[PDB]
């Protein structure tokens, strides 16, 4: 919120490129950058904090012993620093209510296909969800999986890995 042009080009010349950078921010640098009213500074902070910072884990129920046809298991875990108090979503352009939704999504990036997807809500300290996808053919593969937000960018996270298909 309020991040104008000239709040844009002190913190390009500073070397701050992220949402996660602007809480790095010490007390000396914030008072030459952000240079707004009380309201404007309300929103920023108001943002900054329920700005979402999720860690992709992932676990692969049986790895190295798998049958091609059969529906293979999956699990993917994510855990925040802290539980939020609320997921309502803080935006200044958008008029109307949301909360922050997320997509888990799993696929091959090579072959431009998505294997499974699971629409969750981040609401716990620390969740986990089991996801199922049909076993691709026997051989050399590249999945990636994809946790994303619906209503923040530059938010999301990824862990791309192998596994030989027997």
Same mark, same amino acid.
């Given at each position: 919120? &309020? ?137 050399? &593969? ?25």
């Amino acid at each position: 919120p &309020h991040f104008n042009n000239k709040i844009l080009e002190k913190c390009k010349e500073i070397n701050v490129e992220t949402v996660y950078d602007i809480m790095a921010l010490e007390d000396e640098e914030r008072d030459e950058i952000l240079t707004l009213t009380d309201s404007q500074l309300a929103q920023v902070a108001a943002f900054v904090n329920n700005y979402p910072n999720v860690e992709l884990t992932y676990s692969l129920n049986n790895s190295d012993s798998l049958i091609s046809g059969v529906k293979q298991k999956i699990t993917i875990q994510l855990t925040r620093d802290v539980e939020p108090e609320n997921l309502q979503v803080t935006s200044e352009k958008y008029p109307f209510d949301k909360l922050e939704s997320w997509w888990l999504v799993l696929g091959e990036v090579s072959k431009k296909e998505l294997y499974a997807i699971k629409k969750v809500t981040l609401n716990k300290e620390t969740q986990q969800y089991e996801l199922e996808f049909d076993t691709p053919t026997s051989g050399k &593969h590249n999945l990636t999986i994809w946790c994303v937000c619906d209503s923040y960018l530059d938010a999301d996270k990824e862990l791309s890995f192998e596994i030989n298909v027997k």
